[PDB]
Structure formats: C-alpha cells, structure tokens
Amino acid sequence: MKKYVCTVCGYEYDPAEGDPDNGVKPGTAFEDVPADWVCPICGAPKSEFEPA
Template sequence: MMRYMCLLCGYTYDPEKGDPKGGLVPGTDLATAPREWVCPRCGADQDKFAMRDDDDDE
C-alpha cells in the first residue's frame, strides 16, 4: 500500500499500521478513510496529504 505524507508537518500515514487512535484500523488506505479523519500530529485535512514515492522506513 502507498504511504501518505502530511505536507504541513511531515507526518507519514502508513496504511499497514493505520491510526487506531484516530479510528483507522490497519489496512485502511487513506483514499478510503472517512473524510473527517485528520492528521494526528497537526490536525490537517486529508487534502494536505500527498502520496510518498519512496520505500524508506521511519
């Protein structure tokens, strides 16, 4: 699955891990996440995320 990075704070959303605190179970792609989900670090909306094109682990 493709990972996504918040363009405002640099947080990387990894669909394999999800965001359990934010209500996204592992395996949830950001493209199918509820629109009310926001960046857990800075609160940015999903439209502030971009797909990452690398495979670097964080």
C-alpha cells in the same frame, strides 16, 4: 499499500498500521480513511496529504 505524507508537518500515514485510536483499522488505504480524519500532529485535513 502507499504511505501518505502530511504536507504541513511531515507526518506519514502508513496503511499497514492505520490509526487504531480513531477506528482506522490496519490495512486502510488512505483513500478509505474517514473524510473527517486529520493529521495527528498538526490537524491538517486529508486534502493536505500527498502520496509518498
């Protein structure tokens, strides 16, 4: 799918690996990531990401 970048710190969300530690299964499109999911490294909200 499409990777998304955290505009605050550069952390990249990769659909291919999801975020298992938070129940985000691999294959999860960023659009489908939980609304309250935040960037693992800076805490920024989903609204602060940008399609890469």
